[PDB]
Amino acid sequence: RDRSIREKQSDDEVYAPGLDIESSLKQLAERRTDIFGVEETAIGKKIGPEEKVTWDGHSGSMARTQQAAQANIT
Amino acid sequence: EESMKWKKLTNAQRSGLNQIPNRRFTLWWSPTINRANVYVGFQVQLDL
Amino acid sequence: NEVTKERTAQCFLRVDDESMQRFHNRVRQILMASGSTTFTKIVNKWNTALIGLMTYFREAVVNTQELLDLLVKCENKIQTRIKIGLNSKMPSRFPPV
Amino acid sequence: QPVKVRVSYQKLLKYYVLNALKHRPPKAQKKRYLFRSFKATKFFQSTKLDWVEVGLQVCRQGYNMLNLLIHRKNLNYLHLDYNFNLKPVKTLTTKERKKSRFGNAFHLCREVLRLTKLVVDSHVQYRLGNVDAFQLADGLQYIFAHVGQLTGMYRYKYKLMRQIRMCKDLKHLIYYRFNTGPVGKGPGCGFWAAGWRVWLFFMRGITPLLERWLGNLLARQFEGQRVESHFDLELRAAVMHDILDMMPEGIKQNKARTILQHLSEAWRCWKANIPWKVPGLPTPIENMILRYVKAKADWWTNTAHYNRERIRRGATVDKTVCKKNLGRLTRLYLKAEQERQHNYLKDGPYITAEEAVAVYTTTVHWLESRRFSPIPFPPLSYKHDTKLLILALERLKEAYSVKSRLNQSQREELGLIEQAYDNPHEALSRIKRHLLTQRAFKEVGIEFMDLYSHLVPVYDVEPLEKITDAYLDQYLWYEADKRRLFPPWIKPADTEPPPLLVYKWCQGINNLQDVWETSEGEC
Amino acid sequence: FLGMPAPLGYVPGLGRGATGFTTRSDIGPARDAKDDEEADAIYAALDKRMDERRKERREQREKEEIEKYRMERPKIQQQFSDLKRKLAEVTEEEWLSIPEVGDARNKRQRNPRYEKLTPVPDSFFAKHLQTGENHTS
Amino acid sequence: KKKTIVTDVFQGSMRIFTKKLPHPDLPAEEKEQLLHNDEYQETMVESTFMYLTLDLPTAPLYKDEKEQLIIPQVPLFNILAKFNGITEKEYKTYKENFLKRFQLTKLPPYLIFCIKRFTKNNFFVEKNPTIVNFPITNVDLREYLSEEVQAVHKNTTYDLIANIVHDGKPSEGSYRIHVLHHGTGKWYELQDLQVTDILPQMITLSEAYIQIWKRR
Amino acid sequence: VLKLLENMPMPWEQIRDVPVLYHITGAISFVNEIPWVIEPVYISQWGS
Amino acid sequence: WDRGIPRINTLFQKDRHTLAYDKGWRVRTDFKQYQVLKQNPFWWTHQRH
Amino acid sequence: SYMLPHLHNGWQVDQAILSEEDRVVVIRFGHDWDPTCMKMDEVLYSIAEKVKNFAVIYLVDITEVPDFNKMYELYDPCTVMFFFRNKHIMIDLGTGNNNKINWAMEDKQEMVDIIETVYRGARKGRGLVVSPKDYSTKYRY
RNA sequence: AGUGGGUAAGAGC
C-alpha cells in the first residue's frame, strides 16, 4: 500500500487541466469556423507595428539576435 | 537470432529483428546489387 | 463421343473473372502486408499462390490473356517491392539472377 | 508523304480541336492593367531602348536574380554561369548535396531564362555580323523547334512536353511544305513564327506559377489520407466545446475529462452494441451524448460502406486502412446478425409447418427408397474407433504444421491433442460422454478474412469440443461413404478434383444421345 | 513551467544551445548576413490592386456556393444548437453529480500478462520426416 | 375555384406560432434585448394543410437494459401532442434556429396523416422504424383545438379508414396497404396482386406511413 | 521574360526602338509594348 | 510413377492404410477456410490423398 | 489536441525541453485546427498515457510561437520533434528528412515504436536513431 | 522524361 500510494503520488499530469482544455477548444473554435460560429471564413482565419525576430539557428547570427532581443526591451 | 525469437521483446524490437535475413540476403548478392549499372548516380565510399 | 469415338464437340476453357479477382486480391494482400516481412517470405507466398493458380487453372490460362497480363503485372509488383526493400530507389538495369 | 508528317497533322488537329471545344467565355473583369500602376508608383521609369539592349539587360537581370536565389542560405558552392547552367563548384559532400536541392520551379525558371538568353544571343550574333539575317531566322526556328534538345526544361514540368511535341509537329508541317520543289532537304528554313507563338502561349500560362513562387520565396517571411479522419474528431471537439461553454467551468473545470470519458464510453458501448445508461448523468447531457453518438454512427457507417466499396474496385489503399475497415465491417455485420437473430426469435421460425412436413416427407421417401440404414451411435467396441480418432487428430494438428511460434491457445490445443493421442481410450470415452450429455458449450469466437470482395467468417472453437467435433465428422463421413447416403451427383467427391469435375461435366454433356441436334427445334 | 511568461530580452532559439538545420534551400526565408519597409507596403498594395480584378466577383461566387452547400449540410455546432441551449437548464448540483467513467473489463483484460511464445514440438518434424517414406510394395 | 373537391375532402386550417430565436451563443442581456426588439417575437400565421406531417421521436439507439433489443413504440397521443400551444418544436435550420409551435384551427372532414420516414441524416438517408400505437376504433381530436374554434366544430371523432405501411429499407421497400370496407367493417390488406383479409387487431403492428381517417 | 519574347523584332527589321519600363535601381526591365500588327499586312510580309 | 491423377505414389504411401478410412476429405479441405485464418491455395486437392 | 498540454511562448518550450532529464520530449509543431495536426493530436493523445514512463507530449502552436520556424524549418502543416536531454534527436525514417516527422501517421503502434526506438537510441548517447519501419513508401496497394 | 525518397552520430580544437 505504501509503494502504491508513493507511485500514485509519483505520477505527472499527462493531460492539461479543465481551464486549459476549455481555452484550447475556444481557440480551435475561433479558427475552425466550418464547425463553429455563424460566419464561414476559410480554414484558418479568425475574421468571420512589432514583428518578432527569430534566430535562424546559425552561430554567426547569435550576436545579432542577442542585440535585437536587447533592443526589444521595454 | 534464433535465441531472440522469444525473449519477451517489444513490437519495435521484434520488427527490427525480423529484417536480419534480409541483411544476409543483400550481403550475399552484393557484387550484383551494389553495381554502378543497376543503380546509376553518384557513388559514395564508406568511411574506412 | 463414347460411341462414335469422334470429335463431336470442342470445349474452350477460360479462367473465371471471380478467380482472377481472388488471385489479384491475394497478391495485393501479400504485398500490402509486407512492411516488416522478409523477402523470402514474400517470394514463398507469391510462389505458393502462383502454383495453386497455375495447377488448378492449367489449360485455362492460355485463353485468358487478361490472366497473363495480371500474372506478369503481379510478378512485376513483387519484384518492385523486393527492389524497394533492398534500396529506396528503383534500379535501372536490375538483373533477374 | 511519310507517316511522321501525317501523325503531325492529326496531332495538330487534335490540339486545335481540344482548344476549340474546351473554350470558355472570358470572365467579367474590372480592367486592372499591369505596367500602368508601375509608372504610377515612384519606383519605375519610362524610356525607349533598342530591343536587343533590353534583351541583354533582362538576361543580365535574370542571371542576377537566379544567382541571388542560389546564394540564399550563404551556400556559395553552386556556380551558375551566364548561359544559365547550374553546376557544383567542386565535389560537394552528400550533406551539401542534400542541402543544395532546388525545386522544379527554380529549374523551370532557370531553363526558361536560358531559352530567352539563347534568343537574345542569336539576335546579338546577327547584330555583330557573324550570321546573316537568313542564318538568324534559321537559328531562331531551330531554337523554337529544338527547345527540348537545347534546354530540356521538360525535366521539371512534363506537361511542357505538350508544347514540344506540338513544335516538332509544326516543323514537320513546315519543312515538307518548305522543301517541296527544287529545294532539297536541308537546314535552310527560317519560318519561326509558329514555334515562337506556341512558346509565348506557354509563357502566358506559366508566368503566374513562377511569379507567385518567387514572390513567396523572396518574401521576408516564408509561408507553407484525411477523408476518414475529418468528421469524427471535429464532431467530438464540437460537442465537447458546447458542454464546456454551458458547464460553469469556473466552478466545474475538473469535469472536462469526465465529459470526454463519458463520450468515449458511449461511443464504445454503441460500437459494442451493448446497453448504455449512465444513471447520474443529466438528461440534457444524455441527449447531447446521444445525438453526438448518432451523428458519429452515421459517419462511421458511411465511411465503412465507402472504403469497402473503394477497396472492392481495386483502388490503392494502405494497410492500416484495410484493418480499420475490416474491424468496422465486422462490427456492422455482427450488429446486423444480432438484429437478425432477435427478429427470428421474436417472430418465430420462418419455415411453416406444411412446408416442413413436405420437406421431411420428401426426405423420408428418399431414404426409404434407397434402403438407407440410420447411422448408429459409435459403439464401445467399434472396430474403427481408433483410425477415426487418429485421422481427426491429424486433421486438427495440420493447423500448426508450419507455425514456427505458438501462443498459449495453440500450445494448449497441441497438449490436448497429444494427451488424447497418448490415451486413445480416455479420449473416446470423453467423446462419447460429450455426445450423450453435453448440450451447452463455451463461447466460440468469430473473425473475418478480408478477400476485398467478401468477408469470409472464421470460427474459433475450444480444443476440447474441437476434438469431439473432428471425430464426429470423421465417423459421420466414413459411415456416409460406407452406406451411400450421398448420391453420385453430390460434389465434390473423393475421386475427382474440381477440374476433373468440369471435364466430366463437359464429357457427359457431349455424350448424351444426339445432344447437338437442332433440325427439329430441340434445345 | 506552464503559466509563466518569458523573461525580457531572451531568445528562445538561444538559451538552450540548440542548432537548426536546412533540409533544402527552397524552404525558409533567405538567410541574412526607413526607405526599406515603405517599399514592401507599396508592393503589397500593388499586388492587392492587381488581384482586385475579379476579387469581389469570385468572393461573391464563393459565398453563394458556401451557402448552397450549407443549405443541406448545416454546421456541426448548428446541429447541436438546440441541445446546447437545453443544456442551460442544468443546475450546478446536477453538474456535480456526473460520475467518473469506469472500465468494466477486469485485470486479466486491462493489463494481461505477457503472452509467451514457444517453439514447435519436435514431434512435428518427426511426423513430417516419417511421412514421405514409401513402402517398397 | 376556392373550394374544389380535394379542398373540401382533405384541406384543413391550421395555425403556426413562429418565433425567431437569437443565436444561442449570445449574452443573456443581449438575448433579452433582442427579444424585446420585436424581431424575435411570436407571430401567428394561418395556413391550409392537405395533410399533417407526424415527426417520429428519436430512436433509443441503445439496447434496453431489461429486455434487450426492443422495438420502440409510441402512443398516438404523443405524436398528436404537436399542433398545440403547450408544445414547441425547435427547428434547427442551417442559418438559425426557429421556435415554431403549431395549433389546429379547422379540422377537415377527412384527415390525412403522413408519418415522416426516410429522413436524410448528415451522410445518407435512413428509415425510422418506430411504431405508433393508436386506437383503430376511434380517436379524439377535440383536445387539440383552440378554445376559439371549438364552438364551430361538433364532430372531432375520427376512425381509421386507410393505412399505408413501408416494409424494408429505403433503398428497396414494399408498400402494403390496409383498407377498411365500409359495408362489412373488415380490414383488407392488399400488396400487388396479393389480397388478404387482415384482422384489425394487428393493424397497428406495422410501420404505418400514411393514415386516412374519417370524421363520420 | 514574356515581354521581350513577344516583342522580339521581326526578320525584316534591324533595330526596334521599343518602350521600356525599368526599375529605378535597375532590378527589372519590361518591354511596355503589345505587338500590334495589321493582320493582312503581317500575313503578306510573312509570305514575302 | 507420377502420371495417374490419384498419383501412383499414393499406393506406396506410408500411411496408405489409415488414409483409406478418411472419407469426404475434399469437402473438409474446402470448408477448412471457415476454421483457419489463412486462405489455402490448394483448397481443392490433398497431397496425401 | 485540446487534451494535451499546450505551450504558449518559446521560453515555455525551452523550459519543457530542459526540465526533462530521463524522458524523451515529443513536441508537435503545427496548428490545432489543421486536419493533419488533428491526426497527430489524436494519435498522440491515444498514446499519451501508454508511453508516459519514457516520454512526454507537448503541443506548440507555431503561429503563437513562431520562434523556431526559421531554425527548425517549421513550415510543414504538421511536424514532430524528439528531444532528449536538451538535444534534438534525428530519425532515419527513410523519407530523406531525418530531422522531423512532417507527415501524419495513422497507426498509433507505429508512433509508439518510433518513440521507443528514439528513447533507446538517445539513451545510449546516440543522436540519430534508425526507425523500426521504413517510410520511403506508404505501402499502399 | 525527371527531381529527390543517398545527411552516420560523437569529442573538443
DSSP D428-444: HHHHHHHHHH-------
C-alpha cell at E106: 477486469
Q: A11: which residues sit within 8 A by CB, 6+ positions away?
A: I52
CA–CA separation, D488 and D497 (whole Å): 14
Those chains having 3 or more beta-carbon pairs within 8 angstroms of chain F are D, E
I88 touches strand J (CB under 7 A): no
Pairing relationship of beta strands D455-460 and F42-49 according to DSSP bridges: unpaired
Which of E16, E20, E23 has the CB atom closest to I14's CB atom? Answer: E16
Contacts of C28 in chain I (CB under 8 A): 141
| Cross-strand partners of I28 | I59, I80
Please tell me what DSSP assigns to residue E134: B
Q: Say if residue D492 is preceded by a cis peptide, omega within 30 of 0.
A: yes
- Flag if C22 and D450 touch (Cβ within 8 Å): no
Say yes or no: G27 contacts chain D, CB-CB below 8 A. yes
Please indicate if any CB of chain D lies within 8 Å of the CB of B38. Answer: no
Chain I residues near residue B16 by CB distance under 8 angstroms: 117, 130, 132
Matching residue, cell 514532430: I80
Distance from C-alpha of D467 to C-alpha of D451, rounded to nearest angstrom = 29
- Residues whose CB is less than 8 angstroms from the CB of residue I137 and which lie 6 or more positions away in sequence, other chains included: C84, C88
Measured CA to CA, the distance from residue E23 to residue D225 in angstroms comes to 25
| Cα–Cα distance measured from residue H22 to residue D387, given in angstroms and rounded to the nearest whole number | 9
Q: Which residue carries 486433421 as its cell? A: D395
Residue I141 lies in a domain: no
Q: Are I11 and E16 inside 8 Å of each other by CB?
A: no
Sign of the four-CA dihedral F180, F183, F185, F190: negative
Residue carrying C-alpha cell 470429335: C7
Q: Evaluate whether E26 touches D103 at the Cβ level (below 8 Å).
A: yes
Chains linked to D by 3 or more Cβ pairs within 8 Å: A, B, C, E, F, G, H, I
Report yes or no: H30 and D403 within 8 Å, Cβ to Cβ. Answer: no
Nearest CA-CA distance, residue F163 and chain D, Å: 22
Task: Choose the closest CB to B8 out of E114, E118, E119.
Answer: E114
A44/I4 Cβ within 8 A: no
Q: Which of D167, D151, D163 is nearest to D115 (CA)?
A: D151
Q: Is the CB of I97 under 7 A from strand J?
A: yes
Rounded to whole angstroms, how far apart are CA atoms C86 and B26?
Answer: 7
Q: Which residue from E minimizes the CA distance to A13?
A: E2
Return the axis-axis angle of helices D193-217 and D161-178, rounded to nearest 10°.
160
Q: What is the resolution of this structure in A?
A: 4.4
Q: From the alpha carbon of B40, which nucleotide's C1' atom is closest?
A: J6
Q: Is residue I115 part of a domain?
A: yes
In this structure, what DSSP letter does residue H13 have?
A: B
Chain I residues with CB-CB distance to A19 below 8 A: none
Q: Is the CB of I61 under 7 A from strand J?
A: no
Q: Is E18 in Cβ contact with I9 (below 8 Å)?
A: no
Which member of E87, E97, E119 has the closest CB to residue D288? E87
Judged by CB atoms closer than 8 Å, whether chains meet at C38 and B21 is answered as yes
Residue D206, burial from CB neighbour count under 10 angstroms (0-12, 13-18, 19+): buried
- Please report, as a single letter, which amino acid is at residue F23: H
Under a CB-based contact definition with an 8 Å cutoff, are residues I72 and E22 in contact?
no
Q: Which of E42, E52, E115 has the CB atom closest to D407's CB atom?
A: E115
Whole-angstrom Cα distance, residue D468 to residue D466?
5
Residue H39 falls in which region: left (phi positive, over 0), alpha (psi -120 to 50) or beta = beta
C-alpha torsion sign, points C38, C43, C48, C52: positive
| Any domain includes I92 | yes
Rounded CA gap, D345 and D3, in Å? 76
Å between I136 CA and J4 C1'? Answer: 11
How many whole angstroms separate alpha carbon F35 and alpha carbon F22?
A: 8
Interface test with H, best of C55, C57, C58 (most H CBs within 10 A): C55
Half-sphere exposure of A12 (CA within 13 A, CB side): 14
- Nearest CA-CA distance, residue H17 and chain D, Å: 9
CATH code at position I122: 3.40.30.10
DSSP state of I101: B
DSSP result, E55-87? HHHHHHHHHHHHHHHHHHS--HHHHTHHHHHHG
Query: In which element (H, E) is residue F86 found?
Result: none
Question: Chains I/F: 3 or more C-beta pairs closer than 8 A?
Answer: no
- In Å, what is the separation between the CA of I106 and the C1' of J8? 29
Q: Which nucleotide is nearest to E21 (CA to C1')?
A: J7
* Nearest CB to B6; choose among D94, D97, D405: D405
- The reply to whether B35 Cβ lies less than 7 angstroms from strand J is no
Are G31 and G3 within 8 A, CB to CB? yes
Mutate to test the interface with A, among E10, E14, E40, E62 (most CBs of A within 10 A): E14
Torsion sign (Cα): D380, D385, D390, D392: negative
For residue D251, give the amino acid letter. Answer: I
Chain D positions touching I73 (Cβ under 8 A) are none
Q: Which three cell numbers stand for residue F211?
A: 393514415
Residue from A47, A48, A46 nearest A28 by CA: A46
Query: Measured from the CB, is I31 under 7 Å from any atom of strand J?
Result: no
* D336-395 residues near strand J (Cβ < 7 Å): none
E137 vs chain D: nearest CA distance in angstroms?
22
Structural domain of I75? 2-136
Task: Test I38 with D234 for CB contact under 8 angstroms.
Answer: yes
Distance CA F33, CA F26 (A): 11
Taking the C-alpha atoms of residue F115 and residue D474, their distance in angstroms, rounded to an integer, is: 57
Q: Are F92 and E81 within 8 A, CB to CB?
A: yes
Residue A23 to chain I, least CA–CA distance (Å):
8
Residue of D29, D292, D418 with shortest CB distance to E53: D29
> Which chain J nucleotides are covered by protein, judged by CB under 7 A?
1-10
Residue whose C-alpha cell is 493458380: C53
E strands along chain I, which residues? 6-7, 24-30, 55-61, 78-83, 88-92, 128-130
Statement: the CB of D155 is under 7 Å from strand J: yes
Nearest CA in chain I to A29: I33
| Nucleotide nearest D98 (Cα, C1') | J7
Kindly report the number of other CB atoms within 10 A of residue D276's CB atom: 20
B10 touches strand J (CB under 7 A): no
Quick check: C56 and H44 in contact, CB under 8 A? Answer: yes
Q: Which residues of I touch D230 (CB under 8 A)?
A: 35
* Rg of chain E (C-alpha set): 35
β-pairing, F208-214 vs G17-23, is unpaired
Tell me how the structure was determined.
cryo-EM
Compute CA distances I113 → C84, I50, I133, whole Å. 22, 12, 8
Render the burial of D89-121: b for 16+ CB within 10 Å, e for the rest. eeebeeeeeebbebeebbbbbbbbbbbbbbbbb
How many domains, in total, are found in chain I? Answer: 1
Measured from the CB, is I126 under 7 Å from any atom of strand J? Answer: yes
Residue F28 touches chain D, beta carbons under 8 Å: no
Q: Is the CB of D438 under 7 A from strand J?
A: no
| 3 state SS of D266 | helix
Nucleotide of closest approach to D96 (CA, C1'): J7
3-state SS track over D82-128: CCCCEEECCCCCHHHHHHCCCCHHHHHHHHHHHHHHHHHHHHHHHHH
- Residue F39 and residue F21: Cα distance in Å, rounded? 9
Q: Compute the CA torsion angle A11, A14, A16, A17 (nearest 10 deg).
A: -30
- Angle, CA C31 vertex, CA C27 and CA C34 arms, to 5°: 145
Considering only CA atoms, which residue is closest to the C1' of nucleotide J1?
Answer: D155
Quick one: CA dihedral E30, E33, E34, E35, positive or negative? negative
CA–CA separation, D106 vs D104, rounded Å?
6
Distance I46 CA to J7 C1' (A): 32
DSSP string, D276-292: ---SSS-HHHHHHHHHH
> Are C93 and C44 contacting, i.e. CB atoms less than 8 angstroms apart?
no
In-domain check, residue I123: yes
Q: State whether the beta carbon of D156 lies below 7 angstroms from any atom of strand J.
A: yes
